[PDB]
Amino acid sequence: SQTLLVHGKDAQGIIKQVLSEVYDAVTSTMGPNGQLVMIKNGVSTKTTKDGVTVARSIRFADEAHELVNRVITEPATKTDEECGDGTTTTIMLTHALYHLFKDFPGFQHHRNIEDLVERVIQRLESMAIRVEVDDPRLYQVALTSSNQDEKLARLVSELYANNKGSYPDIELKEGVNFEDQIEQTTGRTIRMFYANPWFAKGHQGGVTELTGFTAFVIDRRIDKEDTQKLIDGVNHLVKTHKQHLALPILLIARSFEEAANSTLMQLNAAHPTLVEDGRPWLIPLSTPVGGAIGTSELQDIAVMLNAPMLSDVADLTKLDTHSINGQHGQLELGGNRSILKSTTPKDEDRIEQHARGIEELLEGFSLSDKFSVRARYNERRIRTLRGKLITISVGGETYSEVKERVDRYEDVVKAIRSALENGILPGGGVSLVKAVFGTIKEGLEDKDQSAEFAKRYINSGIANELMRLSTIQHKLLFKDTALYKENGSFHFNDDWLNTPTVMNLATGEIGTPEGLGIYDTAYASITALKGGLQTAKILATTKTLILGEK
Amino acid sequence: SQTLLVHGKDAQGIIKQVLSEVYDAVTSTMGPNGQLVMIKNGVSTKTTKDGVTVARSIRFADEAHELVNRVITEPATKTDEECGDGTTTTIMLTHALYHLFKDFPGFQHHRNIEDLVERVIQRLESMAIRVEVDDPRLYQVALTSSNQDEKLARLVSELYANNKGSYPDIELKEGVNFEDQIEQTTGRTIRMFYANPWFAKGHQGGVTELTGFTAFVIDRRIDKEDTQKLIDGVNHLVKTHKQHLALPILLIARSFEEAANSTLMQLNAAHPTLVEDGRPWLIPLSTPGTSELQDIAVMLNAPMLSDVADLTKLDTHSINGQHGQLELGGNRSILKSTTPKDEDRIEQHARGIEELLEGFSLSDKFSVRARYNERRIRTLRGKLITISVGGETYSEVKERVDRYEDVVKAIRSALENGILPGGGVSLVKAVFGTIKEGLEDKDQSAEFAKRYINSGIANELMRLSTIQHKLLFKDTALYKENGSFHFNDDWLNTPTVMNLATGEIGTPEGLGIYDTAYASITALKGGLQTAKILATTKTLILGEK
Amino acid sequence: SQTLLVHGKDAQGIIKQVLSEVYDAVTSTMGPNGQLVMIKNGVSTKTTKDGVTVARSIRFADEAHELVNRVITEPATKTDEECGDGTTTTIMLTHALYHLFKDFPGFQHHRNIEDLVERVIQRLESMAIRVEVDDPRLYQVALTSSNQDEKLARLVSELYANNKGSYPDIELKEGVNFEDQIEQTTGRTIRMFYANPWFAKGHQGGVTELTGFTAFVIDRRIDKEDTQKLIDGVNHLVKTHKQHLALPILLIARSFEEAANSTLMQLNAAHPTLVEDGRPWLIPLSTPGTSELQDIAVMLNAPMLSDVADLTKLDTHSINGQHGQLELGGNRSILKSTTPKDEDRIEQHARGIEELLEGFSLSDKFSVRARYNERRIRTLRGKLITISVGGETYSEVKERVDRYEDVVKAIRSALENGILPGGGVSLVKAVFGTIKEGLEDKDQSAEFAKRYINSGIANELMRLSTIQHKLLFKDTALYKENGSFHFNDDWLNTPTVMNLATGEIGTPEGLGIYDTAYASITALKGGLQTAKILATTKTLILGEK
C-alpha cells in the first residue's frame, strides 16, 4: 500500500524475484531424491515432497509479490486438475524459458523463440510412445509414479492387463482393514452430473441412488429462453403419459443455466403427489461436451439409458410410448459423475450393437487418421460404453496412512489411464534434450530451409541457448551423483543422444530410461512445455503491476 | 492529511508526476511490443492489455495523487461508455498536449494552441470517411479485426452488404455443428421492458410472447401522483372502447414508480374476465431524448400522449390495436411480424429523420444530436440476426464466438462512427495539413505565421502527431532504415505504416488498418480539454469537511 | 510474518536449532536421576520428569520454530498413545540420526544409512525376549517402569502370575481408603452399547441386567433404507421361531441411525405380550475392523449376518438363545456367567487367532495388524479386574493411579511384544553386532565394507548407540573421570550398567533392568523416519491461504 503502481525495471525485478523463489522451492522436491517442504496450517505441519502441494501452498507477504505468484502457480495447479501430474516440470520450464526470453529481448526474437519451441513441442508429440494394457511398460510407468511401490504397480498393472478387451474405470474408498480389497462391477462411469445441488437426495448435492428412471437426452444449451418449452414439456408428460413412466424423469442436456434450473425446481413443487422420500422426480443433468465432439457423447448417454435423442426442448411435447421408455435398472447420480450398475441383458445387446457401429467407423479410415483426435475420441466413447467399473477399498494400519495410500493409488490410476490414453516418453529429463537437439539438427540439416533457419535461431544464439535449457531437468536430477563429473560437467554428444544415459535414483544403477524403466506420461511433459512457454512469455512481457483495489 | 491545501509549483508537480505515471502505464499497452499489466482484485490476478481496463483500475495511495488521477482517467472511461473505443489515445494526447501548454506558458499562447488544435479537429472531421455497407472497406476492417480471417470477414461483410437498407443487429449462440448456421429475421430490438416482473407470463419476469396488442405511449414519469389518472384511463377504455381492442393493453412510458405499478396490478384484478392463460391484459413498459418514445409509438401504431389524463379523451380515430407479433422481455422487447401496411409508416418516418440530418452543419454531423438520430434510424430499420457458431471442440467454438463478437463490434462502430486511416497517421496528416493550409493561404498567412509558426507552436504540434506512429512503430524494421526524421512530402502523400499482425509495410488504406472517426476525433477533443485543465490548475484541496 | 518462505541454509538452521532445544529439554529428564521441568498453565506450575508431558507441552514463539517443533514432537506423542512408553528415546535418536544424515550428505549415503539402520532394527526384533506370566522378569520390568516401587511391582506381577491361563484386563478407579482394594471378575468388557437410551431398563439409558438372551450380529450400518428389512426380520422370528427363543432379542450391529431406532421402538410396542417388567424384548447395540463383531458373535453364540434381510432365512440350526448372564450399558456391555460349553467355543476361537500370528513375519509381529489381533484375544480371554487405588491425600492417590496405569501398560506390552535388556545397552549390542555380521560374512563383506565401513558411516553409527548409555551413566562411578568408557569385546559379552536406584554396578540381566521391546524398537523406527524428514527438508512455508 506504500505504492500501488509498479512500472518497468521495478516490476520485472519483482517478477524475477518471485519466480526465483518459487523455482528454488518447487524444484527442490524433484524426483524421489526430492527434498522436503514443511507447511503450516493453523496448528499442524504437513511435511511433503509433492510439487503440486508445495506450489499451491506457497504464499508471499507483499501484495506485489503474491500478485505475480498467482500467475506462476495457477498454471501448475491447472496441470494436475487436467493431466494428473507434472506441475514441477511446468514451473521449471516457466523459469528457464522466462530467462531465455529476457536473454534475447526485442519482439522479433520472441516471435522466433515461440516458433522454435512450438516446433520442439511437435517433435515431442511425435516421440510419444503409445501402448496396450498387455505391454510391460505400464508397470514401469506405474512404478515411477507410485514413488517406487513394488507392491501397487503390480496390482494395478495386473488389473489393466487382466481385463484385455475392456478399459477399467477405477474408484477409491477409504477401507477398514490392513489389507486392501477389490470389487469388480459391471458399472459405467457416465459423464452426467447434477445441474444444481437442490435436485439430489437431501436437497444438497448428495449421492442419490435409484432403482428405476425415465431419461430424456436434449442437445441444446439451456437458459432463460427455454423456460416455457420446459413447462409445456414436463406437464405434457406428467399429465398425458404418466401411466408408462418410472420416476424420476432425468433431463440430460449440454448445459442448464440458472434461469432454467429455478424453473424446474418449481415444476417439482407443482406436483407434490409424485415426491417419494424427498427425491425430486425431475433432475437436470449437464455434461462437459461442447462442439460436434459434444453431440456424440450425449448419444452414448442416450443409448445406455434407452432415452431418445432430441434436438430441441420443444420436442418434449410431441412424444408417445414409441419414443418414451422408462428403465427399471439401477443408477447412482452424483455431483462429479453418475454411475450405472444394473444392466438387463436386453440393454447390453443395444449397447454392444452401438459399440460395434463405432468400431466399424474406425475400420474404414486412413492409418494417419488412426492417431487423430477424431479416432482417439471415438475410442474414448467405446470405452465409456464397454467399461468395467472397479471399486478398490484401500486399507492400512492407521487413518492417515490409509488416506495417504488412497492418494498414491489415485496418482497411479491417473498415470496409467493417461499413459495408454495419451502415450509414454522416456524419462530422466531426456526426451526434451532429444526433442530440442533433434529439432535443431532437422532444420540445420534440411538444405531447403537451412538458409533462413540459421539466420533466425542458430546465428542469433537462441538455438544454442535452447539446447542448454533441455539439460536443466537432467542436471537437477543427476548433479551431485556418480553420473556427473565432480566439477559439474556432463557431455551431451552424439553418442549420448543415440543411447541416453540416466541413473535410477531408487537403485543407483546407470543405464537408459528404456532399460531402467523410467518413463513419463507424454501429456504431462508436453503440457508442461506448452504451459511453461505461455506463462514464461507472460512474465517476460509484463511491465506493470497494479495493486489498486478501488 | 499532513497538509490539505497544495498551491503552485507543488500542485503542478503532483499533476506532472501522476500524468507521467498514468501515461507510461496506459501507453505501454499499445503495439507489437505491446506490454501487459497485472491487476489485483482480492485474491486474483487479471493480466491485460486493454487500455480502458488498465486506466479504470489504476490507483494511487496519496489522496493528492488520486485526486488528479480521477481527472485524467474519468475522460478515458467516458470515451468507451459513449464511443466504444479509444481511451489509450485520449490519455496519450492528454499527456502530449499538457506538456505543449506548459512549454508555451502565458495565456495568449494557450488561446492560440486551443485555436490551432480546434482547427486540426475540423480537418479530421472533414477527413472522416462515412462508410456504407456496400463499401469494400468494411471487409478490410473486419479482416484486420478478425486476426486475418479470410472466411469470417467475408461472411459478416456479406450480411451487412446484403441487407442494404437495414442495419443488422447480430446475436451469437454456442452452436452444435462443425459448421456455422445463420437465422435471419425482420425483428427490431426495441428499448422497452417490463416495469415489474409480475406483468410477465407466469408472473415472474419471463418472456411473454404475443400475436396481438394495443399500445399507448405516454411521456411523463409515473409515480404516486398518477394513480388516479390511470384508474380513470384504464376503465374508460375497457368499458367504453372494448369492442375495438386486442389484448393486452401496453402502457409504454418513461418510468413507472412502484406506487403506480401496484395500482395497475389491482386494475388487472378488477377485470378477471379478460385474463387469457394467466397473461395480464395490461403491461407497463419503461425505457432508459423524448423522441425515442416517438419511435416506439410509430413502430406499434400507438398514439403519442403528453399526459396520463389524456387516456380518457380518446376514440377509434386515436385507438389502433395491432394484430402483429411481439416478444416482451425484462431486458428488452422484440417485434417480429410487421404487415407491409406498417412498414410503409416506418420507412416514411425514417425518411423524415434522414431529411433532418441533410440540412445541418458538418461540425454538428459528429455531434451527439446527429449520432443519436442515426441511432433512431437503425432501431427503426433493423433486422435481428442470430448466428450459431460451431467447431470441432467446445473451447474452439467458444473462442470462435469471441472472434465473431470482435468483428461485429468492429463493423458496427465502423459504419456507425465513420472510418479514418489508422496507424497513427490521420493525425499527422491533419496537423501537417492544417499548418500548410494557413501557411499557404496568403490572405491570412501574415498573422498565422505570427501566432503559430514564428512562436514555435506549429513546429511543436507537428512533433506531437508523430507520437502515436512512433509508439507503434519504434523498435521495428520501418524505423531501421531512415529513422525518426522522414515525415517528408513523399510520406504525406502515401503514408507508410506496418501491419503489426503480419509484418508487411504499406499504406493504412492498402493494408486495411482503419480507426473509427468518432473515437480518434473525441480522443483529440477530450485530450485537449483535460490537458488544458491539468495545465491550468494551481490548487489542490483535500479538505473533506 | 516478516517473511513467509524460508529456503535452504536458513531453513535447516531453524531445524537444527529447534531440534537441539527440544533434545536438551527432553533428554534432561531421562532415567530416575532425570532432572525436572516446570510447566506453566494459566495459574499453576506442573513440576515433572515425564518425557511425554515435557515433549507435548514445549512451545516456541516463532511460527517457523513451532512449525518444526510439531514435526519433532508429534512422533513422540504418537508412541505413548500406541506403545505406552518411550518418547524420550525416540527424540534422542531423532536428534542423533539427524546429525548422522547431515554428517554424510548426498543421497547415496542416505540410502545406505537407511539400509544399515533398518538392519539394526531387525537385529533388535530378533533380540526381543518373549515372556510368560509365570516368568520372574515381569516383576523386574514392572519394577523399572514403576520408578522402583517394591510394593506395586509385586502386586501386579502376582495378579498376572496368579491368573496363569487368562490375561487380566485391568481398570483403575480413584478409591477412598489409605489401602488399595482389588475386585476380580470373570467377566468380559465387550464393546457393544445401547443405540438409544429408550431400550434400557426404565427406558432412560440405565444398566439393564439380564440372565438370558438371543443375540444376532449384523455387519451393515443401519439407517432409513433398512426399516422394512427389520420389520420383515423381527416378525419372522417372533411369529415362526418364538418357541426356541429367550428374551430379549439383541440386535448387535455397526451403527443404528435414528430412522431405524424409532422403527424398532414400535416393533416392541407391536408385541406387548412379550414385555417383562418394562424390559423391552429387543435392543439395538452399536460398536465403534469388521472382525471385532465376529468376536462379539462368538462370545454370545449368535450368528454372523452380512445383510439385514438375512434375518428371515433362519432356522434352529442358526438361532441359538443363551441362558447365561449379561449386563448391558450405555458405555459398554459386560458378560459374566459363561457355561463351560461356551468357554470351549471361545478358547477354540482364540487359538485360531493365535495360530494366525504364529505364522507371521517377525517384522509384522510389531505391526498394527498383529497388535489389533492381540487386542481381540484379550477381549476374548480376559478376566476383568478393577483396582481402586488409595492413599493419604487426593493428589497422592491420583498420582498413584497414574503410576499403576504406567505399570499395567508396561506389563501388558512386555508379554504381548517382548522385553530387552535395559541401560541403553541393547542398541549398542544391536549395532556392534550388525556391523560384525556383515563385516564377517565373506559372501557380502566385499560390498558391505564399501558402503558402510569404508565410507565412515559404520564407525559413526556405533558411536550413536553409546548416546543413551552415556546420558544415563556419565557423571557416575561407572565412567572414568575424564568421560571415557570403553566398549570393547569384553563389555559386549557381559555389558555393564549401573542401577540408578541402588548404586550397584552389574549387567541389566543381573540387576533386573529391562525395557519393553516394542517401545525401544518403535523408538528407533520412528527416530529414523523423523530424522530423515528433518535432514531432508529445505523449505518452510508459514503462508496461510
Ligand SMILES: Nc1ncnc2c1ncn2[C@@H]1O[C@H](COP(=O)(O)OP(=O)(O)OP(=O)(O)O)[C@@H](O)[C@H]1O
Ligand atoms: N527412479 C528415477 N530415476 C531417475 N529419474 C526419475 C526416477 N523417477 C522419476 N524420475 C524423473 O523425475 C522427474 C519427475 O519429477 P517429480 O515426480 O518430482 O515431479 P513431476 O513428475 O514433474 O510432477 P510432481 O512433482 O507433481 O510429481 C521426471 O523427469 C522423471 O523422469
Ligand SMILES: Nc1ncnc2c1ncn2[C@@H]1O[C@H](COP(=O)(O)OP(=O)(O)OP(=O)(O)O)[C@@H](O)[C@H]1O
Ligand atoms: N534403575 C535404572 N538404572 C539404569 N537405567 C535405568 C533404570 N531404570 C530405567 N533405566 C533406563 O532409562 C531409560 C528409560 O528412559 P525414560 O524412562 O526416562 O524415558 P523413555 O522410557 O524413553 O520414555 P518416557 O520418558 O515416556 O518414560 C532406559 O534406557 C532404561 O533402561
Ligand SMILES: Nc1ncnc2c1ncn2[C@@H]1O[C@H](COP(=O)(O)OP(=O)(O)O)[C@@H](O)[C@H]1O
Ligand atoms: N495491425 C495493426 N497495425 C497498425 N496499427 C494497429 C493495428 N491494430 C490496431 N492498431 C492501432 O493501434 C491502436 C491500439 O488500440 P488500443 O491499445 O486498444 O487503444 P484504445 O484502447 O485507445 O483503443 C488502435 O486504436 C489502432 O488504431
Ligand SMILES: [K+]
Ligand atoms: K515431486
Ligand SMILES: [K+]
Ligand atoms: K523419564
Ligand SMILES: [Mg+2]
Ligand atoms: Mg513424477
Ligand SMILES: [Mg+2]
Ligand atoms: Mg521409562
